[PDB]
Amino acid sequence: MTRRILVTGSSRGIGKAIALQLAKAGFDVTVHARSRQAEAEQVVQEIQALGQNSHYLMFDVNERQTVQQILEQDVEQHGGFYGVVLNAGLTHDGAFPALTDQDWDEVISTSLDGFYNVLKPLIMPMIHLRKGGRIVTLSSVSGIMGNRGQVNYSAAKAGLIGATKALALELAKRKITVNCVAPGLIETALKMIPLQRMGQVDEVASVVKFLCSDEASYVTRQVISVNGGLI
Amino acid sequence: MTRRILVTGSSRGIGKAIALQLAKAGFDVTVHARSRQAEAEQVVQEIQALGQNSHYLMFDVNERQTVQQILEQDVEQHGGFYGVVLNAGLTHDGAFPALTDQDWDEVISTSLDGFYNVLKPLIMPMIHLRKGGRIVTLSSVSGIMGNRGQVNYSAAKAGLIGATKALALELAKRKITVNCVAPGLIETEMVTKEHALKMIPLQRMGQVDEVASVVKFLCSDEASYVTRQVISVNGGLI
Amino acid sequence: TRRILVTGSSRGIGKAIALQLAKAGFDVTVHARSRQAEAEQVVQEIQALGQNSHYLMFDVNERQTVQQILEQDVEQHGGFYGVVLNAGLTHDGAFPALTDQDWDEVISTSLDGFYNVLKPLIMPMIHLRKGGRIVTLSSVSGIMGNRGQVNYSAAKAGLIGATKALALELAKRKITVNCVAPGLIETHALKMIPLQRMGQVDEVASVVKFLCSDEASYVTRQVISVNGGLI
Amino acid sequence: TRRILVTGSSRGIGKAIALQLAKAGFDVTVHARSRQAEAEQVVQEIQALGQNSHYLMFDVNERQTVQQILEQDVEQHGGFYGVVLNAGLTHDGAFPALTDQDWDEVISTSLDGFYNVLKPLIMPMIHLRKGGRIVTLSSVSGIMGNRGQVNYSAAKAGLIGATKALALELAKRKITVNCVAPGLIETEMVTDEVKEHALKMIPLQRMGQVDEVASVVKFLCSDEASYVTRQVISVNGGLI
Structure with a gap:
């Protein structure tokens, strides 16, 4: 059976570019979105047109019990996921003393709760x-x-890095690599970027696609920056 | 007058060591504990015996509304804090598939909501x-x-680093430095050790004062050009 | 056709890089210090893969000889689109026991190698x-x-600084400059590697090949570690 | 008393380090490449603070001279408890425009300086x-x-790798080995182009003072910093 990869937030933007590149690489790809159902179906159709199998799942990554039920059912119907790309996140910008409770909690939870809620039901089906x-x-x-x-988004995205590195250590014995891609400013003050432009969605997707390939088998525990030389 | 520093989780361990070194350096130091009131009052009397003013505050850093009321009342009574040391944290160890919802949520929130719940009421008083x-x-x-x-504690403690660095950027123009201290294996963490000592180049656990000295240095006036940094105190581990 | 110089490509990691870049569609120029027959065998393999190839022989520490050979090669065959700098050797020992030669050969082969090879090639690349x-x-x-x-760590760390600074100088010409940092490669720390094995040469070469590809256009100034999760 | 060598300590950051270490209670040996009278001024200030001091003259690139002077000094005054390596110069320019001297003198002064100064002093320190x-x-x-x-970045990155490796070799001797990485500091001989670019990027919006760097070095040399090793500590106003 063909290896299948879940990409969260893949109805548009970077997530869609990742989904399409993984399909071109020969993976079956399952599309996900929180609310834009018609948009998710368009991506499913494009993946099918590339010759792979696809369908979409709808959920808010913060809805722990609903995510668990949808993923457990999907694994029962279609087998475990070989790969998971955790792409969905959220910003609520503002000066730290001006941030509301919602500005803080929604940004923290979407990245960190999302990591736990999506990956917890899928680790054992992946190992199996x-x-x-x-x-x-x-x-x-x-x-x-x-x-x-x-401050909220920096905390959420930094926490993701720590979770990724720790999980890489736990899953290394099972030959599951776990890596992080850290985009800079992407099209979806450029005076600080050495390449002097925003990045394109495919310039981020290509890095994710490389890490998901069999060729990247000795890369794990890494954060790869795709930021035009910003840092 | 005398600059005052809040140290969370300072009734024992590393937090206590930080509070005593900051008192010896000439700061007034406010002690904090989640629930061990008698322990906290012992550190308060040690700080007083070291020549500085001190009292304790009791709260769970996760109780957002309670923390705000306690800190806002404390600032009204005693003035803004010149310094805040966020030392309190929590572990719930276990392999990622073994972690319970509580194992995950309590570790993430104690560090990251603790950061927001304690610092949000205190930033403007500090600036003022x-x-x-x-x-x-x-x-x-x-x-x-x-x-x-x-995986839970690594995410919580990495998230603290991101928050620290971003806050450093916002507060630099007020001459408030914002830094992080990252201890390795310290004598107050309970472990069963022999493998860990083989990974640490110094081949021993750190002592509480070896961590507190770094915190004390960063709080000193001499550290005025150090901000946005993560300083590791780990015997060479990384 | 774009042409890439790979130093030290008659064997090992350098050879695997040369062959992967040939399979990707680049013309590849092979280099060796002295093993001429070995270099010719790699050239013949690149030709059998359908690309043009020849070899150049030089000590990367012989500054003037390197300049003459490379300037003549650029006049005969055009500027290099890419350069993979694979230059270094170890002389291990306790620091107070290292000889002058242990120190100077290790420092110079990596850092004078960088200067000696890239200085004559930067302007032909830009042109x-x-x-x-x-x-x-x-x-x-x-x-x-x-x-x-201590000597090898200094030389290898020095390459990272030179790479990051050169990335900043060349970004405006759309030349990306990156570093690949292998761990333990097959060419006893195994209890220390999370994947519990040495890397294979193609696991390093794949990362170099990805960075040389058109897809990697927004990646620059980076150090990418291929070390099985060692750090 | 414990004795510390500070190279390039006749002026600037190195002088600030030497004086702060003398105030902390170390005997401090001053070093300069060519300015003997400048070095003797710092020696006299350290003596006035109540510590023992003298100066040593050498180019850190002249390997055999460094070894002879340092081994003679250790025979006369005992081993150094501490060494602060303040060694390096710039020769700025676009990479294709760097001369052989621009490259070689920058690489060697930092990396050869590390080897030339420290190799004769490790065993006297251990002893x-x-x-x-x-x-x-x-x-x-x-x-x-x-x-x-590109040359200075390579030289200073190489220093970091050497420092981290040496920390591992000496950790069991209770010798800590660390690196301090200043940003844009007053008295630093830097180009206007480097200086203007740095100011816009520094969150504190100013250059550092020499004592803001020396204080970090002084802390790492104190007995309290005994669990800090293998580290690079940035003193740069938030630049990175």
């Missing part, structure tokens, strides 16, 4: 494939160095 | 002192490199 | 007016240091 | 049987690179 696996998280340059107006 | 300031968070080598059985 | 690729090979010991390798 | 302190001075350019400084 007995063929290794791939987990890639999407952080941010702000998770590496911090950013004004983004 | 108009004399700079100091914020030091306590992370962990696990936040830098990850650790087996600690 | 192609089509971007470019530079990849240097460092080591995990350049990132974190290693007992018995 | 004290009371631990020790080694601190190297790198730069933010060694951590992230800088335009016009």
Whole structure:
């Protein structure tokens, strides 16, 4: 059976570019979105047109019990996921003393609760494939160095890095690599970027696609920055 | 007058060592504990015996509304804090598939909601002192490199680093430095050790005062050009 | 056709890089210090893969000889679109026991190698007016240091600094400059590697090949570790 | 009393380090490449603070001279408990425009300086049987690179790798080995282009003072910093 990869937030933007590149690489790809159902179906159709199998799942990554039920049912129907790309996240920018409770909690939970809620039901189905696996998280340059107006987002994306590195250590014995891709400023003050432009969605997706390939078998526990030389 | 520093989790261990070194350096130091009131009052009397003023505050850093009321009342009675040391944290170790919801949620929130719940009521009072300031968070080598059985704690302590660096950028123009201290294996962490000592180049656990000395240095006036940093105190582990 | 110089490509990691870049569609120029027959065999393999190839022989420490050979090669065959700098050797020993030669050979082969090879090639690369690729090979010991390798750790760390600075100078010409830092590669720390095995040469070469590809256009100034999760 | 060598200590950051260490109670040996009268001024200030001091003259690149002077000094005054390596120069320029001298003198002064100064002093330090302190001075350019400084970035990054490796070799001797990486500091002979670019990026919006760097070195040389080793500590106003 063909190896299948889940990409969260894959109805548009970076997530969609990742989904399409993984399909072109020969993976079956399961699309996900929180609410844009018609958009998710368009991506499913494009993946099918590439010759792979696809369908979409709808959930808010913060809804722990609903995510568990949807993923357990999907694994029962279609087998375990060989790969998981955790792409969905959220910003609520503002100066730290001006941040509301919602600005803080929604940003923290979407990245960190999302990591737990999506990956917890899928670790054992991945191990049961007995063929290794791939987990890639999407952080941010702000998770590496911090950013004004983004104490919450910098915390959420930095926490993702720590979770990724720790999980890489736990799953290494099962040949599951676990890595993080940290984009800079992407199209979806450029005076600080050495390449002097925003990045394109495919320039991020190509890195995720490489890490998901069999060729990247000795890369794990890493944060790979795709940021045009910003840091 | 005398600059005052809040140290969370200072009734014992590393937090206590930090509070006593900061008192010896000439700060007034406010002690904090979640629930061990008698322990906290003992540290208060030690700080008084070291020549500084002290009292304790009791709260769970996760209780957002309670923390705000307690800190806002304390600032009204005693003035803004010049410094805040965020030392209190929590572990719930276990392999990622073994972790319970509570194991995950309590570890993430204690560090990350603790940061928001304690610092949000205190940032503007600190700025209004108009004399700079100091914020030091306590992370962990696990936040830098990850650790087996600690996916939750690694995420919490790495998240603290991101928050620290971003806050450093916002507060630099007020001459408030914001830094992180990341201890390795310290004598107050209960372990069963022989493998860990083989990984540490110095081949021994750190002592509480070896961590507190770094925090004390960052809080000093001499550390005025150090901000946005993670300083590891780990015997060479990484 | 874009042409890439790979130093030290008659065997080992350098050979695997040369062959992967040939399979990707680049013309590849092979290099060796002295093993001429070995270099010719790699050239013949690149030709059998359908690309043009020849070899160049030089000690990377012979500054003037390197300049003459490379300037003549660029006049005969055009500027290099890419350069993979794979230059270094170890002379392990306790620091106070290292000889002058142990220190100077290790420092110079990596850092004078960088200067001696790249200085004559930067302007011919820019004059192609089509971007470019530079990849240097460092080591995990350049990132974190290693007992018995104060000299090698210094040389490898120095390559990382030179790479990051050169990335800043060349970004405006759309030349990316990156570093690949291998861990323990097959060419007893195994209880220390999470994947519990040495890397294979193609697991390093795959990362170099990805960085040289058009897809990697927003990645620059980076050190990418291929070390099985060692750090 | 414990004795510390500080190289390049006749002026600037090195002088600030030497005076802060003397105030902390170390005997301090001053070093300079060529300015003998400048060095003697610092010696006299350290003596006035109540510690023992003298100066040593050498180019850190002249390997055999460094070895003879240092081994003679250790025979006369005992081993050094601490060494602060403050060694390096810049020769800025676009990489294709760097001359052989621009490259070689920048690489060698930092990396050859590390080997030339420290190799004769490691065993005398170990033979004290009371631990020790080694601190190297790198730069933010060694951590992230800088335009016009491919040579300096390489030299200062190399210093970091050497420091971390030596920390591992000496950890069981209770000798800590660390690196301090200043950002843009007053008195630093830097180009206007490097200086203007740095100011816009520094969150504190100012250059550092020499004592803001020396205080970090002094802390690492103190007995309290005994569990800090293998580290690079940035003193850069938040630049990175």
